[model samples]
Target: HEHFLQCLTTRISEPVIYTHDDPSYFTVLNSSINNQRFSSPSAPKPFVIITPFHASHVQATVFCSKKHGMQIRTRSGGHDYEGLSYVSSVSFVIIDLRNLNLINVDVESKSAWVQAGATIGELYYRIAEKSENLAFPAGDCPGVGIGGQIGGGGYGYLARKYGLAADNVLDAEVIDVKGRILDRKSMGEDLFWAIRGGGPASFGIVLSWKLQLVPVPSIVTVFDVSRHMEDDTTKKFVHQWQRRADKVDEDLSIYGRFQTESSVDNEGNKKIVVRASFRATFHGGVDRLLQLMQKEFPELGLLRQECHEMKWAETFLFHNNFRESLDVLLNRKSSFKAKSDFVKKPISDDIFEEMLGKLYEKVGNAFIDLFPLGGKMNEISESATPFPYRAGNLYNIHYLVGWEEDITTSKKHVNWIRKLYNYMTPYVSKNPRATYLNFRDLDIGTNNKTTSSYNNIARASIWGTKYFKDNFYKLVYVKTIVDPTNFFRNEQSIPPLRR
Candidate 1:
């Protein structure tokens, strides 16, 4: 009560700020509630939630909080699976950047400068509003803030064609603890490289990103196809996919989603049913896309009626699961949780079938997603930036499980997802198995409060090897030179510079 009062009293002098004493504070608290990963008792609550209206406000907050021995968690979007962004074990303050949401697009030159608080969906909407030909390559969710998405090497239907959202970022404004707003050039190559794909939750608060937007054809193709075990040609179609998915032309991108469940055979014996779907978004008109699909993926027997051609922005809406009549860019969220991996080699059809069969025995509702990679993503070198999952990576896999409510049911769902991940051990990369930093999973490994070089190496190497390969050590060195006190630490966050 006393500490809250002190902080509240101190904050009253500041304009354009909000505290718990504000009547509207509670409303703001529950507005972006993440029901899937947190429930009251098991949920995380910050000591104080600070809403900053400007860059200097964040700087002052960091300075004051540091002096008072407080840790800081910046939340542009609370998509952190474990709720690390707004939840902490130690005394902390939630720096809600929601008020800083802003988007500026220069369509003529094909570029955009977007605030970290803005969602990818919002960016797309703004870009489309300016010009139909310009679009940014970001995640499918419009609700996910650009801070978390771009900071973690963002990808979407445009990824194979233009590479990640991080790849296109030419400049950024990040306020370090000293309250210095550094751009790509001012932050030096190391810090800039670290934030590109390593994430900003642990680094500092990013204000905005100046990204290079790519061109999209005025009309593009979108298709959704489902194949169950009963699909007679499933075997042949899947085989053909292994041979050509990554080899497809740059303008075409396809992704596969599969979930395991129970089914009954014709005779009534129990069988593991694999429900799968392939949704593709092409960068050209329907006519060209149809010809390419027929030539490259004839095994699937696609028809013109099966695909819809819409404006580029509309295609964005369709990918996000909006109904046919709804605007494709609607329902963009302020939060989400995800985990991912890279597949260097395509598994054979027989191996793929066996993998799905094993997934049926798992205990949860998690889904497995496979996204093809080639095109522009392969053109970048492993050492070009912090993101090293280029060239050799055939596809990326997303292992996800989400739920609502704070009951035992959520635990069961989480357990099921973990089981599905464990079942994938044989199929995913080995040696130093790789994982995507964007779809962060604390389950992979972790470092201690005061991380030692030896411990940090052992802990980070697990997922680090998967995401950056050899670049992990460079990231650590950069962290050392920047935030040596390990102030940016989290459950699965990158460790600070180790001596």
Candidate 2:
């Protein structure tokens, strides 16, 4: 402890280190933890937490952590699904980036540079303040930090039209294993490309990203058209969407969800039923949206009076399901366990019927979000970045299970989602069973359990190729070049090719 403090002398004017002995250590550690399971008293704890406010502080933390032989876990949003950002089984130093949150919108250049710690909500809020017509493409979760979102292949409502968030990055800043700060130019395209969608924590500690903002319409339309039925038409309603949702206009994004809901029958007795909502956003107004729907997906029945019109920025709250006022976007508290899959073809509605029965079995325990892929996502080259689940995919499925109960109950919720994931295997992507990186799942390939400095090339590829496809090899090549010693690693971080 003495040497750790001595090594930090004069790096900054104020103290940023919080040890277990500190009164604020638990408070600071639990503040941004999105997964409640990791926050429980029994979960693992960091040897120390450093919430850095500047690049030098990150460099210093990296320097001391390496010198002291402590694993460095760089946490941005604390939203890593499997708690890879935190909950290291071994003693580790956490470089919590909450204080690094910062955003500078250059509306003139139609771009913005956002720090790794800034939440997607914060970035969109800043972009709205600058220009209502300009926006950055990212996920619906307002609390997810910029690093976790873009560093993996970020998907959202605007993705079909604008591509994944990583696809729009113009530049980035990272602190490498040698404790050197390198920007995109200094890092070279290979390293820069690796970080955009390769999970930067595997390569280096990311500082910030220069995002190429896309244009949005001043007037956009939103709607929630639900089909509450257990009949053939409802299956047709869900099936018809799969047929046209992706091939439609790029300006329109039709994302829907499947979940269990309670319904009171004529006898006043309640029962669980499946609800499919065709929740969507159109870059244009309601008239055009309705026109597009009628011409394309008429089975869902999008009525004119059902749609709501608002500025593109307002869609942030809408996408958030209107949890509260816009100010809630700034709050960091959240909890859930999630998993993901990319669909190369449409799924069978017959299978959807059976899944509805599982939803009924669990009451209102989980929901599945469906996001269409195409438009800009299909055009980007698979080799352009580490993210390779594009072009051939019809859409992506995000399985989310939320519970307010304790760990014992958490098990049931997790298992429920896992069962659903297993049931869908026969119908989803094949060969490697493609998955999304942003929705990180440890169930897949993990680093060699016995070591941290390198991964079994054969073992890592099991999950690596699922997320990056063939680009996984390319990422390994870049990882070898930038972090050959494998100083930075997580459960599923890209590993050096040679030990």
Candidate 3:
């Protein structure tokens, strides 16, 4: 405890240090779901939780951690689904970046410098306050920290149109394991490429990001159309959408969702509803979008009243299903787990129905978010960066389940989600079984303990392949050059070397 405080208090003029005994310590460690049982109490509890208000404080902490033979875990918003960011099986300290939450918006440049601790919702609020025309492409959830979000290649409604959050990242301010602060220019393109979407935790802790914002139409159209199995019309449209949505206008992006709920079949037999919602957003006026939809793919009827003309920020709220307009910017916290995969081919309706049935039998009313790709995501090359889900992809799939109960209940839902993932084996990307890094699942890969120098190529492949596909090896090379000692590592961090 004395050593922890020495490293922490020496760095910052004013610092807040908490041990296991502090009241805030529990609050800081606990997440949206606390009922889930941990493997053990002593698994990976930090010796202390250090909340640093300045960048130098982080430097001192990192330097001291290395000096004292200690491990450190960095936490910004603490939204890790697997709790890998906070919970560890080793003895370590947590550098909570919450105090560094700050945003500087420049409407003139159409860019912003967002701190790692600040939530995406806060960034949106700041951006909307400055200009509705300017915005960044990121995740739907509000509390996620900019550090992990961008490091894992953030995606949202704007992804299909503007690509990923990482795609537009212009710069970043990260502290290497040696406690040096570097940005895109100072870190060099090689290191910059690795952190933008390559996973920063493997190399260092990110302090903030310099993001390039995209412009949007002043008045865009947004709508959500839901379809149940009972409605053959919706089912037929679902099939047709799988075929025609890609060919739709570049300005329009339509996504689908499937959930399980009890319903009656056409024959009046008791059944579970595998409903699909095609939520769409158009960059131009609703009338133009309506005319285009009518000419391109008109299956579900959409009236003028069904669509709303809202600003870009307002459309973000609408896409997230925020009932109150104000709730779009409001930050509501939760404990949940999220996992993702990319599907390259069209999944047959029969197999899709069978999977839904299995999910319904296991658990009901889970949220599944699918984002349509192609447009800009397809134009990018596979070796450009660590995010290699580009081109020849139909859509990306995300599975989520949340509970307010104990670990057992959370496990039941989490396990069910994994089961659903396994069932999708025949449909998703082959060879590597591509997965999203932002979702960050540890079950898919293993860590190499022997590669203490951060050259754990064998171990990184476990999780790296899922996120970067063939580009994983290049990421390892960057890791070796930037953080050779592997000072920054979690259960699923990138490696510095291969073989």
Give the alpha carbon lDDT tens digit for every residue of 1-499 in model 1: 3554365457545634455677776566665555345536455666667777777677777767766777888887767666677777787777888877888899777888888888777787888778888888888766787898888888888888888888898999998867688998899988888888887765777999999988888889999888765575766777777667878998888888887777779999987777878999999988888888888888787878889888888886677666455553343421223566677777777777766765564424557788888789889887777778788778888876554442476556567667656766787777667777777777777656544677776777776766678888888788777777666666666676454
Model 2: colliding residue pairs: none
Report model 3's TM-score to 2 decimal places: 0.91
Which pairs of residues collide in candidate 1?
A: 79-336, 143-332, 143-333, 317-328, 338-439, 339-439, 434-466, 480-497
Which candidate has the top score in TM-score? Answer: 2
What's each prediction's TM-score?
0.91, 0.95, 0.91
Candidate 3 lDDT, 51-153, residue by residue in tens: 8888877888888788777788888767666776677767788888888888999989889998999888888888888887888988867778888888888
For candidate 2, report its TM-score.
0.95
| Model 1: how far residue 144 lies from native, Å | 0.7
**Candidate 3 residue runs with Cα over 4 Å from true position:** 31-44, 263-271, 324-328, 331-337, 407-411, 451-455
* Candidate 2 per-residue C-alpha lDDT over 1-499 given as tens digits, one digit per residue, 9 for 90 to 100: 5676667655545758888999999988888787777787888888888989789888888887777778889888888888888788777888899888889999999988889999888888888887989988888788888988898978888888988899999998889999888998998989999988889889989999999999988999988778756666666767876777778899988887878877888899987777777778899988888888788776667788889998887887776777346644544443577888888877776676676667775666677888899888889898888888778888888888887734467777778878988888888898888988888888876878654434377789999999888999888888889888788987887878764
The lDDT, on a scale of 0 to 1, for candidate 2 is: 0.82
Of candidate 2, the 10-residue stretch with the lowest lDDT total is 326-335
Q: Give the Cα RMSD of candidate 1.
A: 2.9
